[PDB]
Amino acid sequence: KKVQNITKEDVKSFLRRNALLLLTVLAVILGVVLGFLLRPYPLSPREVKYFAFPGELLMRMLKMLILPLIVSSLITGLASLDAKASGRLGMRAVVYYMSTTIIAVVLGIILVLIIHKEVLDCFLDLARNIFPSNLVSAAFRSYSTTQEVEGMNILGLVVFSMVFGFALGKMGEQGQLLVDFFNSLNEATMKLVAIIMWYAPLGILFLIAGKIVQLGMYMVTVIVGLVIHGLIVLPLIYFLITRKNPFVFIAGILQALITALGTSSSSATLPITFKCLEENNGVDKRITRFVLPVGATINMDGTALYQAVAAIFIAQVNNGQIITISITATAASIGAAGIPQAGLVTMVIVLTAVGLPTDDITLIIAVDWLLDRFRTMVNVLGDALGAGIVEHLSRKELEKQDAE
Amino acid sequence: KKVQNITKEDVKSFLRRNALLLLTVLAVILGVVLGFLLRPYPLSPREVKYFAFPGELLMRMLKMLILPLIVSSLITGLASLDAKASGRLGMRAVVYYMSTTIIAVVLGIILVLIIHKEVLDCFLDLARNIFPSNLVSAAFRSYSTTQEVEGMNILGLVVFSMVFGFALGKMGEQGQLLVDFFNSLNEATMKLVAIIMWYAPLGILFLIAGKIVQLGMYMVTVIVGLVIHGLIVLPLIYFLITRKNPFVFIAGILQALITALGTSSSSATLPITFKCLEENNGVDKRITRFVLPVGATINMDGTALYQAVAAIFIAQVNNGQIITISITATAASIGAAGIPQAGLVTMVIVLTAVGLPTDDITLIIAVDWLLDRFRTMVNVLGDALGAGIVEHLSRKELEKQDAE
Amino acid sequence: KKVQNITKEDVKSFLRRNALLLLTVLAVILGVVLGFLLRPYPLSPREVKYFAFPGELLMRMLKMLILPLIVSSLITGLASLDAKASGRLGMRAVVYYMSTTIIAVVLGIILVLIIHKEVLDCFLDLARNIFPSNLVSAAFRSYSTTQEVEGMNILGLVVFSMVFGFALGKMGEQGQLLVDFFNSLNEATMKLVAIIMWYAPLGILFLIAGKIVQLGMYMVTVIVGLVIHGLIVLPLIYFLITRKNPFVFIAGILQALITALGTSSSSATLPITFKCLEENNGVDKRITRFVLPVGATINMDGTALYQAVAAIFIAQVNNGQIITISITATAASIGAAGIPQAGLVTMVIVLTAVGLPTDDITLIIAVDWLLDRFRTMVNVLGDALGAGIVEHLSRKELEKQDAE
Ligand SMILES: COc1ccc([C@@H]2C(C#N)=C(N)OC3=C2C(=O)C[C@@H](c2cccc4ccccc24)C3)cc1
Ligand SMILES: COc1ccc([C@@H]2C(C#N)=C(N)OC3=C2C(=O)C[C@@H](c2cccc4ccccc24)C3)cc1
Ligand SMILES: COc1ccc([C@@H]2C(C#N)=C(N)OC3=C2C(=O)C[C@@H](c2cccc4ccccc24)C3)cc1
Ligand SMILES: N[C@@H](CC(=O)O)C(=O)O
Ligand SMILES: N[C@@H](CC(=O)O)C(=O)O
Ligand SMILES: N[C@@H](CC(=O)O)C(=O)O
Ligand SMILES: [Ba+2]
Ligand SMILES: [Ba+2]
Ligand SMILES: [Ba+2]
Ligand code: NA
Ligand code: NA
Ligand code: NA
Ligand code: NA
Ligand code: NA
Ligand code: NA
DSSP states (O other): OHHHHTTOOOOHHHHHHSHHHHHHHHHHHHHHHHHHHTOSOOSOHHHHHHHSHHHHHHHHHHHHHHHHHHHHHHHHHHHHSOHHHHHHHHHHHHHHHHHHHHHHHHHHHHHHHHOOOOHHHHHHHHHHHHSOSOHHHHTTEEEOOOOEEESOOHHHHHHHHHHHHHHHHHHTTTTHHHHHHHHHHHHHHHHHHHHHTTTHHHHHHHHHHTTTOOHHHHHHHHHHHHHHIIIIIHHHHHHHHTOSOHHHHHHHTHHHHHHHHHHOOHHHHHHHHHHHHHHTSOOOHHHHHHHHHHHHHSOOHHHHHHHHHHHHHHHHHHOOTHHHHHHHHHHHHHHSOSSTTHHHHTHHHHHHTTTOOGGGHHHHHHHHHHHHHHHHHHHHHHHHHHHHHHHHHOHHHHHHHTOO | OHHHHTTOOOOHHHHHHSHHHHHHHHHHHHHHHHHHHTOSOOSOHHHHHHHSHHHHHHHHHHHHHHHHHHHHHHHHHHHHSOHHHHHHHHHHHHHHHHHHHHHHHHHHHHHHHHOOOOHHHHHHHHHHHHSOSOHHHHTTEEEOOOOEEESOOHHHHHHHHHHHHHHHHHHTTTTHHHHHHHHHHHHHHHHHHHHHTTTHHHHHHHHHHTTTOOHHHHHHHHHHHHHHIIIIIHHHHHHHHTOSOHHHHHHHTHHHHHHHHHHOOHHHHHHHHHHHHHHTSOOOHHHHHHHHHHHHHSOOHHHHHHHHHHHHHHHHHHOOTHHHHHHHHHHHHHHSOSSTTHHHHTHHHHHHTTTOOGGGHHHHHHHHHHHHHHHHHHHHHHHHHHHHHHHHHOHHHHHHHTOO | OHHHHTTOOOOHHHHHHSHHHHHHHHHHHHHHHHHHHTOSOOSOHHHHHHHSHHHHHHHHHHHHHHHHHHHHHHHHHHHHSOHHHHHHHHHHHHHHHHHHHHHHHHHHHHHHHHOOOOHHHHHHHHHHHHSOSOHHHHTTEEEOOOOEEESOOHHHHHHHHHHHHHHHHHHTTTTHHHHHHHHHHHHHHHHHHHHHTTTHHHHHHHHHHTTTOOHHHHHHHHHHHHHHIIIIIHHHHHHHHTOSOHHHHHHHTHHHHHHHHHHOOHHHHHHHHHHHHHHTSOOOHHHHHHHHHHHHHSOOHHHHHHHHHHHHHHHHHHOOTHHHHHHHHHHHHHHSOSSTTHHHHTHHHHHHTTTOOGGGHHHHHHHHHHHHHHHHHHHHHHHHHHHHHHHHHOHHHHHHHTOO
């Protein structure tokens, strides 16, 4: 293959086709250079916000499109499938989600054992958010007992849109108008992400430039720990089921992985991960609208590995019970939101379970932002390969719907 | 009939059909037992909230479904009827609402005469809420001058949805798409209340268990006062108009009356009262979507009797003007919200009208919760019998629509 | 013409046809009389709010209908036009908007030369509001860095609805359902403004009555300055393009100009300006839904003249750089909101540009309310004549759509 590469054949065709994909890679390279060049800070945090503003605009655009996407996706997705067909596709997703989150936490504990307001209120608020008291409120607000904190209730909307799509599925002819209504809205918001995809290189540049303006050994532990899980463990899972090339599939969702390294939000990168699967990897719309929104807030393999490493790292300094780490890190992974720094916020639960003090989180916070950008990528990669595996396992159910 | 009852015939068929209805009755019996058994409180109010949490979840589910129900109901209801046909059905509802609220206040004053920030701002805020400045805000917020307090503006949504449904009625063919849109959404949210109906026994149990964790004579006055109005006065009104058995009709809405005793909210129990009339009592959808949402926030016969008893009870301790009590108690009844403890909040208006001090409300508050659960039932019973009476009086208008 | 007027012919026919238009003129005459008669104030501002309450209700009704109008208008408007056809109609609107705002600021500076938290944060917040992070939030909230202040994000909704309508235009057949959905909603909210049009005389009366309960020379400068621009400059622009009578056109939108003098909000008067053009002046719905919502928040000729006069008036007391006044007054005109007193709030930007102190705004505030009612009229007049000019310039594009 090395001798085959020195041919220097068709380089112009690659630059013309992957123009936007190369620009985002160029944005990361220029974003690290520009940020480190302007690293001596004679500027107030107020002036840092002005500097990272072109990246802040991209976030506003992405955060905008999440709500009409999540809602339209599940309502059409759960209506496109039959009562038993949705349960089978669901069980395939649940089995995949639980396995990948438990294998990540096992890899996380092994790698850290080789290389050296209440907790109950955090559980009740999750159950309170799964059942929102007002849907209009849920679209822009979340519950946090002291009462209703700012920011979208993604979980409550996924749960409602699921049941709502299933109810229209039972309605048939009457329910067809609303299913056709939400299918128009999904394609309408998808045609809107295509426009936002061109602003992305300008945004990502200033988004990472503004953020670069014993713990060192720990940083390597997670970063190395994620490379093993994401580039060796997860691609082999795809090859074992689909029997197809995983690194060719990972290349299609590169624009979704590069944006994750910028935003650090599974929810914010979801409208682009939808565009990456449905277009370049030619994944079925009926399953992307099924696996992708659920995996965004639940399938967090990168967080579960981070929750296992950072918890034991706290015990290393402070100087059976390791089984409860693998349980609560899996529990906090599914719980945690697909938004930035939501990895350390849910670490309160994993530390209290073993008896470790929660005041130790302050030590990690400083380097969190860099690991957050890497863990989001593993969370995006999980749903992306997660859709492809479900599609390959449910082609029989998909062929029955194509009859008409 | 006593000799006819000792037959012991078909007991298995009753347990299999009314399985869910018996479970809610069992939930009330178990809810009183469990609450009184755990009555010695070595637990903080924080721990009481944890105990009544399975009941708190049911409330979140019910409060959720009120907004898409109220909106879809009136828009289709006012569009299903003609310009003059809606005015006639309206006049039948208004006449029924005013009569039942004035007869309840007359029964209330008689029973209490036998057995021993500004008021203007409370009126202006009602007129401010009837015309909401922002519909999206109205869906989760209400006005309260100091500015816009938390909680749905049910009145503003009923008023807007009414006019909006009437405007589509005039639009005909163009307006048919939106009428067909909202009819899908109404049946979609109705299929969602069927699912919530199974959680109800688990909720109601902890909802009443958590709440049980001269004023004594007063408690009997209202409780006895409501039994006369609800079980003797109101069923005879149905028999005088429909010429049909009222206690057989009351049995159909038992799941709506039992839930009222738990939630204490006419709005929260409205999605279940809709399911009780449309199914078991086979009431027309065109009139339930017309009488039920309006009666939920206006027809409060149980509150009007409570407002008459509690006002004179305050004068009994403190030691012509009784005509103003019957007027303001009727005025506060129509005003007051279909939510818990909204009976004492509107008592400020009835006490200031006669000159009695508003600081006397503090005496009643302690026992209010128990009477609140009983008065809600009389408010639910009023709309339920209220729909059946309107349906019986408007069959000619209903037969004209069935031609097509 | 003077001899032709003494005929006293058909006076009964004018009172029967323009009954509502004469009532609003009568409301202004009675509103000035009633307000000045009750001018000796032995009443607290709390009692002033009670007095101006019948005008406050009209505002609640108007503010209500703006959000479903703005959203439905642009989505159908941008879908009714072709990709290149919307760009041409857009360029015609942009050219008209920039010319009228630059000619108003030139007239403003001439008339004042004959007759004697940060500024950057105000720019960033505009760019933050053009891209809203949550559409449900945008419908009732706006951004203001300290974080998200109360009141509708009109600009974010106009920008989203524009792109959304354009995306459905590309969708064709699939996108037709949603275009037909939003066309029903536009006509539904238009049939709702017809009802609010009858409350208008009662509202306008108390709206202006409550508001009348060197700076004197300055007041005349702007008032005279607006009469030249609005009644002499702007009608001649219409006559130069359309070749039709402008004062006959101004008569059709009189109910929209009289309401502006009451509300002082281009957004609040927009649902009535829509009813005035589409009915009395028989303007095409495809262009009113295009020019009117954009012009409401951008085309502010009355504000640009006010921003030029009041800035130089501040320099007159305090005792090349005049070019920056004409630039920033145009910049603040497009920026400023179509709501009351938004003329002095954006004056911070025009005063800082030349070096003048922002603390001088306190001097003008006292008389602002009267000039605000007059400048809103010039902003309403600008969009109204602005639609008629675009319609006359784009009849070829309109005739192609009428083929079907
Ligand atoms: C709590 O966190 C979740 C929510 C969802 C899921 C699965 C999933 C994915 N991915 C999607 N899109 O739909 C369904 C799933 C089911 O397991 C069940 C499946 C289902 C099948 C049949 C009837 C249903 C009725 C209502 C809701 C879901 C239903 C839907 C997994 C965990
Ligand atoms: C203020 O508190 C209320 C609101 C509503 C009602 C009545 C009602 C009930 N129940 C329902 N569903 O609709 C109408 C009612 C009318 O009286 C009038 C009726 C009506 C008839 C004809 C045209 C209308 C146009 C707009 C609104 C209502 C209209 C509608 C009574 C009191
Ligand atoms: C920033 O403040 C504004 C926003 C809008 C406008 C113009 C306008 C008016 N009036 C309306 N109704 O639509 C469009 C305009 C364009 O210039 C462009 C035009 C347009 C043409 C072709 C494709 C488009 C795609 C997305 C958005 C607008 C598009 C739409 C002017 C200034
Ligand atoms: N940043 C992660 C969540 C986390 O903070 O753990 C994501 O968005 O996927
Ligand atoms: N609880 C009553 C209202 C009240 O408190 O008076 C209801 O919801 O019907
Ligand atoms: N009152 C003006 C805006 C301003 O205050 O300048 C309008 O609504 O058009
Ligand atoms: Ba089907
Ligand atoms: Ba019809
Ligand atoms: Ba077309
Ligand atoms: Na997983
Ligand atoms: Na998660
Ligand atoms: Na009544
Ligand atoms: Na009421
Ligand atoms: Na202009
Ligand atoms: Na403006």
